[PDB]
Amino acid sequence: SLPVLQKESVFQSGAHAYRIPALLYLPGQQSLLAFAEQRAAELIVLRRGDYDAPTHQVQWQAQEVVAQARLDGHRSMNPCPLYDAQTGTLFLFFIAIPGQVTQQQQLQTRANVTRLCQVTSTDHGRTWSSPRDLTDAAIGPAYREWSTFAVGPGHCLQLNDRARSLVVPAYAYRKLHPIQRPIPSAFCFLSHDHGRTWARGHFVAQDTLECQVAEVQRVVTLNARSHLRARVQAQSTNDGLDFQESQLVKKLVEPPPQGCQGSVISFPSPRAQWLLYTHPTHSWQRADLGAYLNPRPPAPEAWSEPVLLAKGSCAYSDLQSMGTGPDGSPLFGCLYEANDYEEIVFLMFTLKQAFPAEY
Numbered sequence: 332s333l334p335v336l337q338k339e340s341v342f343q344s345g346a347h348a349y350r351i352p353a354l355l356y357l358p359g360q361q362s363l364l365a366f367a368e369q370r371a372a373e374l375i376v377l378r379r380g381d382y383d384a385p386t387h388q389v390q391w392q393a394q395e396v397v398a399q400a401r402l403d404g405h406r407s408m409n410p411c412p413l414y415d416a417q418t419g420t421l422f423l424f425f426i427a428i429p430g431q432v433t434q435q436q437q438l439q440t441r442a443n444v445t446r447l448c449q450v451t452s453t454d455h456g457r458t459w460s461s462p463r464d465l466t467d468a469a470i471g472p473a474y475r476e477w478s479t480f481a482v483g484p485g486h487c488l489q490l491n492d493r494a495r496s497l498v499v500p501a502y503a504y505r506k507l508h509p510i511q512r513p514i515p516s517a518f519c520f521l522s523h524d525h526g527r528t529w530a531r532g533h534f535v536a537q538d539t540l541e542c543q544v545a546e547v548q549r550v551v552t553l554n555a556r557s558h559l560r561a562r563v564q565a566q567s568t569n570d571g572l573d574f575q576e577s578q579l580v581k582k583l584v585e586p587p588p589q590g591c592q593g594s595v596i597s598f599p600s601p602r603a604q605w606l607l608y609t610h611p612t613h614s615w616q617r618a619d620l621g622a623y624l625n626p627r628p629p630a631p632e633a634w635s636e637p638v639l640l641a642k643g644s645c646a647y648s649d650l651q652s653m654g655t656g657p658d659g660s661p662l663f664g665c666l667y668e669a670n671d672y673e674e675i676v677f678l679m680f681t682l683k684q685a686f687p688a689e690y
């Protein structure tokens with residue numbers, strides 16, 4: 332989007348202390364929660380921001396550490412927030428890894444010591460519950476078959492099915508062969524009971540990493556980072572438990588050989604749903620963050636050419652729809668890494684600003 336409503340650095344560090352953004356919109360409060368990892372143990376920080384209607388700007392409040400989102404002796408990473416519309420409760424899923432090499436790792440280099448955790452809030456994110464280790468309940472037997480894993484980063488998904496199911500995007504490094512290095516593959520964790528029980532979905536294609544999911548029958552579309560020149564996408568008709576054959580989305584470039592995390596969300600069509608996605612647009616560098624639109628999701632061929640949101644160094648990003656903007660079109664919030672990881676920038680713009688040809 333050429334013109335934007337707001338562009339503000341919400342996290343800054345010449346030492347690259349802030350990375351891995353996660354954004355969550357609270358529709359009732361009309362506020363945003365911006366999460367990020369803070370490095371030197373590694374912790375998750377947060378800044379609350381209220382959408383001020385009179386000025387149509389988000390007023391960001393002081394930064395605070397999410398003290399509860401951590402396990403003793405562990406580093407916290409990959410903030411993955413979710414708003415449960417049925418209860419109003421907020422979930423912050425995250426990963427916890429020992430701060431130093433453990434005795435177990437000393438004997439078995441690839442031993443899994445990564446933990447899946449969560450903290451919840453019933454007061455719009457002002458205070459959080461003590462951490463809950465979901466590892467055993469969500470992963471189970473497969474745990475020892477991986478070297479490590481992660482969720483998100485970025486916002487999770489809640490479906491519009493009867494149960495208002497929760498879907499948490501993830502990926503795991505599978506220890507498929509003793510000599511070969513572990514291979515990552517994306518998948519989803521699924522809960523039909525607001526996080527009481529969890530099911531682990533089947534993996535999508537091999538060599539897929541950080542991913543996010545959106546809903547558009549109702550299908551869950553998973554958009555993942557790859558080591559190829561294009562994004563990998565797959566759709567599921569059973570809430571993410573099983574995905575149809577993965578596809579390469581040539582219209583969405585991925586800078587080889589490492590690729591970069593990107594974000595995707597669905598939003599009500601301005602005419603079903605459309606998809607909005609953000610990711611760097613350079614063919615081989617993490618640069619020039621762009622916004623892409625898919626008016627006939629999840630068809631890979633329907634993705635639009637990107638509109639430049641920010642020129643220069645840009646990496647990870649996270650999107651959130653924020654209701655209706657001042658001009659009458661869908662409002663969006665985007666948190667992204669910029670300037671060689673020296674900052675995390677917040678951008679707010681509308682669909683009309685980003686894709687004027689639509690109006």
Ligand SMILES: [Cl-]
Pocket residue numbers: 357358359360361455
């Ligand atoms: Cl709310």
